[PDB]
């Protein structure tokens, strides 16, 4: 069952991080009119499992590699058009295709990746797109510009529900020590130096950033739950090099700093690697653990870091001035002894309103989790990892309990008025006036419940409004309240559909 086809145009001299153009599955199934396109009309909406097959010639003397980044949503489409850094295109579920190998084909399950079956007539959420980039480039120029065809073989049977399985159900201990799609920017060894030391930071969960704008990815937030991590990481190296580049390198873990002379260094446990193949290294800590995040007055090398030394240098034949890239990917952590989780089942602060400048004020929340936009009062939000899992994932569902906390600026004996919350079905133009509470501000605490979702079952981050329950906070006399807070714990039933990164 072949449906959809596309081409990508690769210039003669590809560069590292250069943009090779994108293509979307909506265009390929619509443009390439076929059996499956019109079988996708009668079926309504489908949840396809289909294998992309990229057809390129196998040639081992240029040492190219390309990263295919699959974003269901257009977060990074605007970022990536010029000088696409590794972090933007490696923070989304991605597959590396190696030029030495040929006809790379690896399936994708659109149920486990994106979670929501898709419509035909138009697009409700932005189309699932694929971005290609040279992760590292050829040493020297090619003969002339070339091309690659990308095909996707699918079978279309009807989808029963708009929602697949939830990717993860949120709980306080959520980190089991297993990773998906964790890879790093290319480490580069230069040829001139007789020896070389390179260092990879081992403290995951530090929200990798280019230098100006941070990037939230799910692996970082998933590590940020625990306080430090265990030992014995296992990952494999991929040597992106021509056939005539060669290097052999020794891999150890270091805290805090490198022994200068080598006859002290070879005593440590470490792995030699001269080819593309796995290593397994155990994390060396004075405390047997590594914090996994950094404090205010601290650097990144002071903690544990895993180091690559070149004991026998990268050798070169007569003509190459180009550097040799090494890329590592961590499949798993093994023999885990994880420390205490950061946050227990107690509540976490969600939003806090303060500096009310105009009285008889309302604030509208609705079914959405964030994006309140209160124009007569200042608002603040939490850094917590849960609100990070809301920004990383595409669709989120559930119900979350509330509390209110406030204090009084005026004298307690001059107090008056109330803080109410109003709960409707649909927006107040029409509505059924469900359970609403009027708390007098003399009480100073209140607790209620809120639903995030729709009739469809889940609500995404970029805003639309679909019929659901609508909650608004109304303040009778505002100036009284100096500061207001609301902290929320999600009920056990919760879900996150889709996987993505949020470039902020």
């Amino acid at each position: 069952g072949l449906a959809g086809r596309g081409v990508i145009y690769i210039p003669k001299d590809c560069q590292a991080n250069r943009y090779l153009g994108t293509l979307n599955i909506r265009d390929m199934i619509s443009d390439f009119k076929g059996v499956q396109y019109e079988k996708w009309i009668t079926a309504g909406l489908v949840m396809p499992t289909f294998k992309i097959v990229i057809r390129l010639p196998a040639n081992a003397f240029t040492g190219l590699t390309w990263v295919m980044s699959f974003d269901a949503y257009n977060r990074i489409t605007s970022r990536i058009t010029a000088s696409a850094d590794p972090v933007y295109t490696l923070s989304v579920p991605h597959w590396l295709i190696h030029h030495k190998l040929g006809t790379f084909s690896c399936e994708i399950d659109y149920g486990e990746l994106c979670g929501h079956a898709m419509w035909f007539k138009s697009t409700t959420f932005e189309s699932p797109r694929l971005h290609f980039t040279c992760l590292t480039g050829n040493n020297k120029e090619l003969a002339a510009d070339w091309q690659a065809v990308v095909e996707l073989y699918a079978e279309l049977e009807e989808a029963t529900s708009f929602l697949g399985k939830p990717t993860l159900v949120f709980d306080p201990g959520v980190f089991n020590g297993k990773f998906q799609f964790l890879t790093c920017p290319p480490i580069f060894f230069d040829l001139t130096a007789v020896t070389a030391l390179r260092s990879a930071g081992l403290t995951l969960g530090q929200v990798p950033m280019v230098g100006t704008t941070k990037v939230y990815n799910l692996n970082s937030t998933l590590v940020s739950c625990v306080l430090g991590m265990g030992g014995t990481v296992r990952g494999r190296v991929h040597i992106c090099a021509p056939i005539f580049y060669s290097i052999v390198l020794w891999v150890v873990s270091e805290w805090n700093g490198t022994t200068m002379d080598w006859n002290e260094l070879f005593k440590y446990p470490g792995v030699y690697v001269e080819e593309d193949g796995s290593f397994e290294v155990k994390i060396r800590s004075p405390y047997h653990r590594t914090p996994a995040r950094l404090l205010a007055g601290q650097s990144q090398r002071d903690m544990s870091s895993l180091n690559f030394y070149a004991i026998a240098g990268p050798i070169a034949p007569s003509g190459e001035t180009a550097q040799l890239p090494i890329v590592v990917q961590i499949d798993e952590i093994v023999r885990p002894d994880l420390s205490l989780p950061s946050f227990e089942d107690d509540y976490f602060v969600w939003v806090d309103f303060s500096e009310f400048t105009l009285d008889k004020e309302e604030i509208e929340i609705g079914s959405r989790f964030f994006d309140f936009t209160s124009n007569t009062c200042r608002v603040s939000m939490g850094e917590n990892p849960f609100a990070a899992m809301i920004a990383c994932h595409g669709l989120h569902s559930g119900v979350l309990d509330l509390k209110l906390q406030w204090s009084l600026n005026t004298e307690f004996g001059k107090s008056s008025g109330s803080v109410t919350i109003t709960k409707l079905v649909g927006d107040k133009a029409m509505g059924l006036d469900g359970p609403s509470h009027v708390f007098a501000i003399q009480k100073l605490e209140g607790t209620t419940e809120l639903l995030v979702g729709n009739f469809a079952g889940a609500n995404p981050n970029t805003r639309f409004s679909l019929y659901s329950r609508w909650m608004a906070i109304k303040l009778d006399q505002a100036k009284s309240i100096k500061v207001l807070r609301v902290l929320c714990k999600p009920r056990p039933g919760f879900s996150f559909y889709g996987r993505t990164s949020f470039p902020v």
């Epitope: 929200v207 100006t212 704008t213 941070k214 939230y216 964030f370 994006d371 309140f372 936009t373 209160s374 124009n375 200042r378 608002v379 603040s380 939000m381 939490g382 850094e383 609100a387 990070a388 920004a391 949020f502 902020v504």
Partner: nanobody
Framework: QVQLQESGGGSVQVGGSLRVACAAS????????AAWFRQAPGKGREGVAA????????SYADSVKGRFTISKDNADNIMYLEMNSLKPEDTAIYYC????????????????????????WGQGTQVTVS
């Protein structure tokens, strides 16, 4: 990383409007959350209005609403302070200062007015009235 050049301040009659010069981009982004600042003799660094530009969220200072505005031109894509009407006491030189390390807690919130957060500081333009 960031260059800044500004002019457009000078004496004016009450009820007057002084446009402030478009903030000079530097190093090919000019997208960072940036807030103006004021002074008073003996009193340093009180904040003024700001915009979170990419979300189109406006923030104004206390003690002022409507007589200072801050907007971004869609075509020029460069922030500039706008002042449509003016009270006698604008004594200070205004400052333009931007912060580029925005995270997730500074994004959906209102733009902060604290002085300690903004790492890029520049001279700014002199404004006063008789």
């Amino acid at each position: 990383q960031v260059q800044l050049q500004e002019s457009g301040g000078g004496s004016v009659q009450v009820g007057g409007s002084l446009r402030v010069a478009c903030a000079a981009s530097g190093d090919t982004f000019s997208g960072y959350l940036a807030a103006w600042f004021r002074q008073a003799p003996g009193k340093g660094r009180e904040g003024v209005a700001a915009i979170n530009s990419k979300r189109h969220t406006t923030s104004y200072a206390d003690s002022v609403k409507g007589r200072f505005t801050i907007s971004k031109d869609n075509a020029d894509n460069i922030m500039y302070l706008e002042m449509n009407s003016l009270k006698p006491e604008d004594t200070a030189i205004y400052y333009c200062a931007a912060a580029d390390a925005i995270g997730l807690a500074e994004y959906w919130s209102t733009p902060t007015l604290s002085a300690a957060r903004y790492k890029y500081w520049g001279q700014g333009t002199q404004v006063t009235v008789s």
